[PDB]
Amino acid sequence: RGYSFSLTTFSPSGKLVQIEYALAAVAGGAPSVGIKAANGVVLATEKKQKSILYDERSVHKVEPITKHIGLVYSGMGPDYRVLVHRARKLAQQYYLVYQEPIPTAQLVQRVASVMQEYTQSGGVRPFGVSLLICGWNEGRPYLFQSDPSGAYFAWKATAMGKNYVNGKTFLEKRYNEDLELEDAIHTAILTLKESFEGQMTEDNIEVGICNEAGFRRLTPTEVKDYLAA
Template sequence: MVRYSLQSGWARLPGRICSRSCKTRLELYEITYPIGIPLTTPPGTCAVGVKGKDIVVLGCEKRSAMKLQDTRITPSKICLVDTHVSLAFAGLNADARILVDKARLEAQSHKLTVEDPVSIEYITKYVAGVQQKYTQSGGVRPFGISTLIVGFDPNDKTPRLYQTEPSGIYSAWKANAIGRSSKTVREFLERNHKADMDREETIKLTVKSLLEVVQTGAKNIEISVMAPGKPMEILPVEDIEKYVESINTEKQEEAATRRGGRTPGTGTAAILTRPADDGPSAS
């Protein structure tokens, strides 16, 4: 969005007709959302995507529901685009609803036209194209979301993970995070991600990375799992709680091991109590 500094008269939105009598001094600072948020850092709760050997996992941070809120009809941050494609987002829920609807319509249209499901890269390019279009059209603003798009191509067991940004840029990843504290979570994933992780390791890494920013445990974490030829699976809270308990147990054991293997003062005490070498005995 372009910010104006008006010395006199008036001006209308970019791309529309301005009064000929108005004298404006245009000051272009940066391209931002109308709410003042840079295009590269949309707001919202954290979302994580992790690829394993033959699995891809999405994890999202959920906000705590209000006391009178009906959680059964509260929109999820993880959306199914097609039977083999799912999407997680960070940012404005209303914008995500529109973008997801467009992606679903394109996936259905593609299947009816060419009689084949969309590839993950194709639907990613489409979503990124829609986002980019809204950055250069007059009278509209960019979409206030970033997305993680995951799934499996038809007749292919290779997991796919892509990210799209509000500017329209898209890229492929092995693991990535978007939204709140995404830099911290991404650094954690860089240190701990391994190639060819199995199902349990992939889910566990996803939960563990979200615990870097989520302090309230399993009740504020949402996990979806996709495998080739299978529908998207949403893990129940009970299963997520088991992973959280296992991770907390491992952290406690690691802390105990560090304390046990590095007793304060041991090295100094050993030096002070070491018997002196016996010198030659006096005759």
């Protein structure tokens, strides 16, 4: 029928170890980056396949949610698909009621509530995935992060995955308030380049942007384009 008891329980010192381990899985995941420029947002990730056989274009990591929201992850791929489907479902439910695209903050809150439910519900484990959500509402860019625990934060720039400590230290030194989306994209690619262990190609990374026009995943032509500089 299904276990009705929570598998996540407080430890003697007051920590939720299962949430702690879900973050460890996220930490060991693939690096990800998100930078909020002055007139847009950019999300990037490493997509290093195991061998030449895998189809790079088969499955995407930077998946849109609406015409103005897109998100990327660092962690388990299967769990990301579940949250992407729920995120799209929630966005449409909001639109049906209010006849307006769901604001980025609202979508993050609803997605976070879904992940929180899996830390308290019965017979489930936490989503071992961290999400980065970008949006453009009311003439302003937004960048959010949502962790396994269900807590979400608003970032100007951040990174996740392996060596995210060095990734954030890197971003702090290089960040600037008045950056431009082009400079933001260039910095995002370099941030990934910090710990990549190989030659970066248009097939070995994925990028998406969001601006007044709307969120859209950059084509491999453009990704190679930016890489050249």
